[PDB]
Amino acid sequence: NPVERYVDEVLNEVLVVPNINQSHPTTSNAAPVLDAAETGHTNKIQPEDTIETRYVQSSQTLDEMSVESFLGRSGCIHESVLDIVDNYNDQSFTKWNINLQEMAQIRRKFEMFTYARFDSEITMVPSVAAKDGHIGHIVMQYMYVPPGAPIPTTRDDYAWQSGTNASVFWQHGQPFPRFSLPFLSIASAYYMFYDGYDGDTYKSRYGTVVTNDMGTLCSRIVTSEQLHKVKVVTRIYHKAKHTKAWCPRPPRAVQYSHTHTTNYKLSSEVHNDVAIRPRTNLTTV
Amino acid sequence: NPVERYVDEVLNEVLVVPNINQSHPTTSNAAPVLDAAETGHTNKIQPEDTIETRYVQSSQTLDEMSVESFLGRSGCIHESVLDIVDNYNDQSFTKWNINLQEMAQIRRKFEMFTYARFDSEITMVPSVAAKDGHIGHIVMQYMYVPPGAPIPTTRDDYAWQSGTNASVFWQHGQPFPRFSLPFLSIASAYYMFYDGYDGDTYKSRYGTVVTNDMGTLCSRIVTSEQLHKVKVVTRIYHKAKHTKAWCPRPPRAVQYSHTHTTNYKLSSEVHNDVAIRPRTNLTTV
């Protein structure tokens, strides 16, 4: 009764955890607590096997631990700056090579899987700082330039016509812009990691830069030059929808250095580079 | 089950591409790879006929290549400027002879067909530049003057009453104006090209200017003179809806020069006028 399915969605009780059953004292030659970690399998012993448990009816649910929930929250992935200082024509537009590698918070979550396939919801938060006192009427244009399409080189480049590319025009004082994007890869899943090159020579590139080309985000202040200078900062947020992930992996332990690479820095006293806190000795809690 | 039709629309799987079937070694006197291009027909050979193919289940779809999709995206077709410099009465209004020939991006796509019939969705993006610091309360009026109707000659011309013409009033700070227009021609399709004249003498006009009269777009700042000068730029975007196109043609290879004409400029070194890049020789990839 799917309706029953709907009620479970509303209460977040789709995936229930099992109950603890009552157990008793035992004396046998089946020793569940004993095993061999060498096998590469986790011992499957439960509390009822080691202690004498009572019967407890588990109410906990695992909905929130789903991959959909874990990766389904908007996080900042970029902060775009259009700062008008001394030349409107040169400073009223910019571009960004799209990627989910610049902000540690969301990059780390996605990188807990080797491959992930998902649709994206992009939300933009623009804020206009009145450096001289007035913002006038700010209208912005954010254009998605897929790899190959012409990239604008001036604030009036013909590419801003957007004859085929997707552009979102936002007007100051209206709700934050937002749109969805379907799974964009030429493969079946996005590579979070890639142990490969784009050639077989000492100068070939290594890593996800070979596979994760997403294009460019070109943006500009549509409004023409105003007397008062403004600094417009547009923060881009991303959220994964309808997610699937494969082959889980260890979380990033040290800080990120660059995009598309697992490269890291190591100082002279390494314990400062990882979250591991030095213990005084084996017996000091 | 039209509902089934709806599901295909949602997933964009209305037009599927065929599968590749398994083929085998052959020895016969039917040679599909051989033919005669003189006939004006393309050889109909498929991969299974030349190599030995495996069976592959094609999932690709052609929805996005439909004429509806190709021409169904808003592109800029005009950028209107009302720049208040020294005379509000003369500079607060203007007019434009409507056409889809001024912006190369969309003009080129439409011109890949000889005739096209479609409804139009017009969206306007106005931006008010505060040249002196304030924009006040800007209210704009965009009026469609079909051929024959009186064209305004002053900011208070009686024609702005719009007793019968369609006008869209936009107030600064409200969503971008948008409206639809039905197929407007006096013929069954719009002429993208026209090998004809409006007379039979050496002074008759040639081309689409003879057939594509769409009228004028008259606009003005409704607000009366304000102390601070503003520059209002309104960009008009057009999108074709419910499209049909006939007789496809070669894409424009050189830059456009003027509206309604296929005229072009040619420099001394012609390879700079076309997108063709000079090859070093026949064997240099």
Binding site: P2, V3, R5, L15, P182, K241, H242 | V10, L11
Partner: peptide, 29 residues
């Protein structure tokens, strides 16, 4: 268009746009 269901507590589960990428978070399990 959307999937009305009945038992009476209808669950009009609407999808407002014509693309699958447009809908909200997925059902679990």
């Amino acid at each position: 268009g959307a999937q009305v269901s009945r038992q009476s507590i209808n669950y009009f589960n609407i999808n407002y746009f014509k693309d699958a990428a447009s809908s909200g978070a997925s059902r679990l399990d």
